[PDB]
Ligand binder design. Structure first.
Ligand SMILES: Nc1ncnc2c1ncn2[C@@H]1O[C@H](COP(=O)(O)OP(=O)(O)NP(=O)(O)O)[C@@H](O)[C@H]1O
Ligand SMILES: Nc1ncnc2c1ncn2[C@@H]1O[C@H](COP(=O)(O)OP(=O)(O)NP(=O)(O)O)[C@@H](O)[C@H]1O
Ligand SMILES: [Mg+2]
Ligand SMILES: [Mg+2]
Lengths: 468, 482, 483
């Protein structure tokens, strides 16, 4: 057992002294037993004269110079495998839900090498989500990164819950939700909502694992949680060969946390006050999220934009890794469309013939071109009248108005709140369903038969109820 | 000795660098030969950095320094009610000793993910605008934010004034005890405030923590954490406290002073890399506890002062992203007459409806809208306006005027919903704009004279039954006609 | 305990190891640490040497042994690297085993001076209609690819490397153009997928990939382009021609600023160090066309720069603009509209290309350049009159616009380009619907491929057009339109 002594305390910065060449490596976790639990320090620098500089993972009030520090002989480690599902886990891998210890198979370190260039998969591919708007228009990349936009009032946590459910039921993959700089009141919220919705079942089978690095944790803890949680997702790919989901809310708080830690360690800040290591820090997270030959980690990350300046380093860096976006907009939810996805603001890199097939692309494309023409016709409808349109354009507003209501979908997890049983719409369904409307096969169908329905067979069925 | 004592190596700018104290805990309190105190923030190899609690004319090189063996703490408990203390809980009001239930540290871990319950009970501010549109619940952290001289303290104060309704009661579970944290205000200003609270009989349920403008920086930086423990006594014993940090701009500034003097790496605006953690540590301590844990509550109204509206400034950004919403005030609206100068467009409570008396929610559901659309069309109030868009202009005008409110005059919920019922449903459209003042005034006194029963049902059941809406619809038209 | 070929680590942090000893070390000499990770001796002082780590700080500890190499940072070069993918130090990462190297150039090598050079005269035919007609690239030239993110920057480089399939299959040595793709700060996944495309189109056999991806130690990203330059240079130095693509320099300069800040170099504009210009300038100077006396080898560079919100006025963009011999600017506005390649005509220029562009294109694209820089102008002023004279020029403008849209992975030979341009400039498309111009192309190609194949053969071999041949295409086009 390798012991040291604390020689300095400066806020979240702790300096610790060892014996020659008996120093912990940089990134190793060190421990100090406290009255309450255990203060964990992560080694950041070797200063020389057998001292190392560490960042605390918890408060340092009351530490005394000369206190015994222990080397753990490795990075911070977390319990992995199915035992984590349904549990709440902090940065240092402790359970924080008063359900005793996570009796897990192994613990992996939170700092891991990304997959080798040779290990990398060579073809981009779609992760089918069962959500129409997503699959048709802004499809997610299997093993990629999706930026998610919009806050409360847009059903974020249901959308996030729906993806956990679908991914598990449709591809047999579990999810990890990481709260980075999570508001505690809202962590307490989410936990209680996940139990109500079924995605957590303290008795049954839980589809998600929870990791929280709360706002009131110091900069060290907030910087590292995304990793903690990520590692959990990694093992499901590395050992069970699953298509995992990873949730980061919020990725910006990941960047600010790094910003804060760098500042604390005395590094000269870079442009706009950020860390000089902003880009490699982002890499060292993101590059671990990918398809391998075993499976894939697909990460949906909530993205906040400072000052609404798209060119701020924080977003600018993040956007360099995002394969696609899903924009939830109050402008959509006010029209009663759930999910509240913006069909034109949400975009994908994978929306390309060579990735999705020529058919899929062509449906999506005209679906997108129709909604645009509709948008630029809203202003003349408000002042002139519905009758001031050309033969083909009075047909395509009638068409879009339908397409629009067809993009809404009842979610399975939201049934406890809605009473409406939920649809999981297969991709092949979604392409064919919209292909059929675009040709004009269903102009005879009234508009209300498109609201909250799955496949085209549900449009055929519902229209007959609203008549006979 | 050296383990429990030290010698002053250097002193200046309220920092004393001290040799020895080899057994001192980080953030521990010390004592200088002259009797001035300070806390150890910097444990370094050769020496300890200590920040002084008083003038540094009183420390000299060579001087002897003693450990106290205490992390900074404060008296707590009900014996603090009606008192004005400093940051360390010393009485400054001249009413003698403070009777403390026990003691608590300035720094306490916030309640976890587990020992909490979703916010669900109204903190009723009595401000028509706030309660109807930016409702605050118990356990919430709702920021009051704006430029200087826009009514920020006034909003918090009127809230404190409003708690009289329940604080004069016997029902402990309905009371809301109040903690006002004056950080860096001037002494006369604080005295002025205290005089005001006395004048409206609100001192009795308040505690005032005052680290004024001329007090050493670390007292100003401690004050919000200290006050939090004082308020936390209530939450921890199944009661409910409201805490107002007036204001966290000035605290941030104090914290920065120490950091720059202790030569810690500076960042944006010369703030230390842990200045976010200063405010998150603090503001996470407001919480609604679960059943198991006594269901107590602390609600936080931090204040932030912006510079010419810039919410992108470093500290505004930190607090805005830490809390649960903003009540946003504006000079524009102020001089226009709209007081409180709440910017409805840029204000929100993320807790929302779960924090709002059902009765109010029922009338206020629409009000959120009739104003939203009013803002989207407000530009048109300059000749050729069609039927639909003029109608929305008539309501908006009137509903804006309805939300105007005199200072130190919070309304009861059962006084609020009638007024908003009248506005929302169109009973004011007839009444000319300059008279909506006297309208509210008489309408309530006419309701008290002749319809006391409905008010009582609103007050006691909090809901509106279909029968009540009808009783309200009739009462209103009745009065409007005269 | 040798303290001349060997040192002990004093301290390590922020990507810098401080080592005691190594008395006989050279400046910029590579070192090897206990753990196997390598480093560069950056600054030598009394009492210690500062070493920049080519890996994670984790891998170095205080007390560990550090070994000399007697090698200034260098790389394996030669023809054996064709078809391989290596990292910044030249380490094989495609999993294909030991690199077959003819030798080892230094990473930093000085550029050829005033005398060993000669004016560009040979073309790098991109196979891109927009590029080769408007902003032509000569062998030995440096042209910058620049625009916002997600604007087809890579696709212009890529379809160029692809297009060399035509020549690198033949015997003719002087016409062979070997490719070097330098991925700097990109995702691993992307680069792997890209390499997948290069193989899918066979092009991998003549190209070399050097990659320092997004998660790799900043100094490995700072180094990549230089070592890639060394590799590209072997072909220049030996009499052949190599093309080098730096994707992208923006990310490199970002990697560079990181080190400088961590080293405590004064931040300047946008917090970049004072010498960030020098970083790029020394690199792109190595792209040259050599004289008769030096084998006539050519290195051609296509640096990629990423603008933020289309602002070409930023520090780094203007720096690289001021080093290159022109830039192809790709407008995000056109790219979203569908116009791809999204070349902005006014903002794009090649500074030396004209005198190197194949003469055949030069004639049929008569003033095409100055014209499209003016149609675009009168177009914005159109949205006060439905005027007569400017109305026909607008139809010409739109037909030439729609004519320059081109698919990715579809590069065309010069002989396919020339007639397409002839049909536009000379107004043979003005009678055709807007939404049909794309179909016109391959049908007009079908026609030239199965009937007038004799004109197409001529263009390839000459590189010109005779008066006789000009009147020949005249007839061929007009017949097709009416059917
Ligand atoms: N609701 C109200 N109606 C009318 N007047 C008001 C109202 N609220 C505040 N005022 C007056 O407006 C002035 C400023 O209010 P105050 O509550 O001090 O704002 P503030 O933001 O705290 N200013 P400061 O603390 O000096 O930066 C005082 O003169 C108040 O009396
Ligand atoms: N001529 C084209 N027509 C249609 N799509 C294209 C064309 N060229 C490129 N694309 C696609 O458009 C997307 C972005 O272009 P890309 O070549 O990646 O440019 P870039 O500027 O390198 N983007 P990034 O590297 O992410 O900043 C890619 O998915 C391309 O496959
Ligand atoms: Mg005030
Ligand atoms: Mg690219």
């Amino acid at each position: 057992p390798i012991t040291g002594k604390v020689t300095a305390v400066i806020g979240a910065i702790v300096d610790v002294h060892f014996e020659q060449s008996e120093l912990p490596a940089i990134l190793n976790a060190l421990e100090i037993k406290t009255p309450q639990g255990k203060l964990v320090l992560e080694v950041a620098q070797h200063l020389g004269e057998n001292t190392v500089r560490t960042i605390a993972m918890d408060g340092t009030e009351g530490l005394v110079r000369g206190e015994k520090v222990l080397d753990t002989g490795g990075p911070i480690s977390v319990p992995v495998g199915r035992e984590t599902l349904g549990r709440i886990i902090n940065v240092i891998g402790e359970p924080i839900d008063e359900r005793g210890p996570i009796k897990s198979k192994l613990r992996k370190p939170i700092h891991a090498d990304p997959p080798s260039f040779a290990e990398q998969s060579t073809s981009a591919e779609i992760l089918e989500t069962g959500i129409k708007v997503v699959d048709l228009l802004a499809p997610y990349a299997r093993g990629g990164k999706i930026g998610l936009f919009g806050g409360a009032g847009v059903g974020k946590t249901v959308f996030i819950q729906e993806l956990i459910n679908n991914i598990a039921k449709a591809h047999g993959g579990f999810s990890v939700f990481t709260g980075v700089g999570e508001r505690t009141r809202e962590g307490n919220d989410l936990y209680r909502e996940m139990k109500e919705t079924g995605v957590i079942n303290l008795e049954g089978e839980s589809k998600v694992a929870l990791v929280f690095g709360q706002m009131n944790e110091p900069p060290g803890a907030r910087a590292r949680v995304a990793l903690t949680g990520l590692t959990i997702a990694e093992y499901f790919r590395d050992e069970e060969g699953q298509d995992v989901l990873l949730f980061i809310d919020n990725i910006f708080r990941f960047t600010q946390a790094g910003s804060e830690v760098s500042a604390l360690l005395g590094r000269i800040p870079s442009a706009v006050g950020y860390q000089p290591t902003l880009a490699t820090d982002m890499g060292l997270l993101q590059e671990r999220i990918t398809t391998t030959k075993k499976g894939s980690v697909t990460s949906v990350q909530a993205v906040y934009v400072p000052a609404d300046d798209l060119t701020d380093p924080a977003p600018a860096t993040t956007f360099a890794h995002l394969d696609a976006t899903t924009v939830l907009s109050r402008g959509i939810s006010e029209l009663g469309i759930y999910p509240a996805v913006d069909p034109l603001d949400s975009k994908s890199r994978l929306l390309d013939a060579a990735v999705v097939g020529q058919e899929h692309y062509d449906v999506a494309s005209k679906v997108q071109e129709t909604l645009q023409t509709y948008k630029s016709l809203q202003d003349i409808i408000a002042i002139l009248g519905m009758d001031e349109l050309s033969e083909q354009d009075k047909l395509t507003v009638e068409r879009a108005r339908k397409i629009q209501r067809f993009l809404s979908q009842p979610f399975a997890v939201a049934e406890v709140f809605t009473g409406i049983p939920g649809k999981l719409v297969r991709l092949k369904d979604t392409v064919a369903s919209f292909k059929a409307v675009l040709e004009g096969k269903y102009d005879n169908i009234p508009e209300h038969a498109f609201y909250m329905v799955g496949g085209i067979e549900d449009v055929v069925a519902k229209a007959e109820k609203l008549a006979a | 000795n050296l383990n429990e004592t030290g010698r002053v190596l250097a002193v200046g700018d309220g920092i004393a660098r001290v040799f020895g104290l080899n057994n001192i805990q980080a953030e521990e309190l010390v004592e200088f030969s002259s009797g001035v105190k300070g806390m150890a923030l910097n444990l370094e190899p050769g020496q300890v950095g200590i920040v002084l609690f008083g003038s540094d004319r009183l420390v000299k090189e060579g001087e002897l320094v003693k450990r106290t063996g205490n992390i900074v703490d404060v008296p707590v408990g009900p014996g603090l009610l009606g008192r004005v203390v400093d940051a360390l809980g010393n009485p400054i009001d001249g009413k003698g000793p403070i009777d403390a239930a026990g003691r608590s540290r300035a720094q306490v871990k916030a309640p976890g993910i587990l020992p909490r319950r979703s916010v669900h009970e109204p903190v009723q501010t009595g401000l028509k605008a706030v309660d109807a549109l930016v409702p605050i619940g118990r356990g919430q952290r709702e920021l009051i934010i704006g430029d200087r001289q826009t009514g920020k303290t006034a909003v918090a104060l009127d809230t404190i004034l409003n708690q009289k309704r329940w604080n004069n009661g016997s029902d402990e579970s309905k009371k809301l005890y109040c903690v006002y944290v004056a950080v860096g205000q001037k002494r006369s200003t604080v005295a002025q405030l205290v005089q005001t609270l006395e004048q409206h009989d609100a001192m009795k349920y308040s505690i005032i923590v005052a680290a004024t403008a001329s007090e050493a920086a670390p007292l100003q930086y401690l004050a919000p954490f200290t006050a939090a423990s004082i308020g936390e006594w209530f939450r921890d014993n199944g009661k409910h406290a409201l805490i107002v940090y007036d204001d966290l701009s000035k605290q941030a500034v104090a914290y920065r002073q120490l950091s720059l003097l202790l030569r810690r790496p500076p960042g944006r605006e010369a703030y230390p890399g842990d200045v976010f953690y200063l405010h998150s540590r603090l503001l996470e301590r407001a919480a609604k506890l679960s059943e198991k844990e006594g269901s107590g509550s602390l609600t936080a109204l931090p204040v932030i002062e912006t510079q010419g509206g810039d919410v992108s400034a470093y500290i505004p950004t930190n607090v805005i992203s830490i809390t649960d919403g903003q009540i946003f005030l504006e000079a524009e609206l102020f001089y226009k007459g709209i007081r409180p100068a709440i910017n409805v467009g840029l204000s929100v409570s993320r807790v929302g409806s779960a924090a709002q008396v059902k009765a109010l929610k029922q009338v206020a559901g629409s009000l959120k809208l009739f104003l939203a659309q009013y803002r989207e069309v407000a530009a048109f109030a300059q000749s050729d306006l069609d039927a639909s868009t003029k109608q929305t202009l008539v309501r908006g005008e009137r509903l804006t005027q309805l939300l105007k409110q005199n200072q130190y005059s919070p309304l009861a919920t059962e006084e609020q919903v009638p007024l908003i019922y009248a506005g929302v449903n169109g009973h004011l459209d007839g009444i000319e704009l300059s008279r909506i003042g006297e309208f509210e005034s008489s309408f309530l006194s006419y309701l008290k004279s002749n319809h006391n029963e409905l008010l009582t049902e609103i007050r006691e059941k909090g809901e509106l039954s279909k029968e009540l809406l009808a009783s309200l619809k009739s009462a209103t038209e009745s009065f409007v006609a005269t």
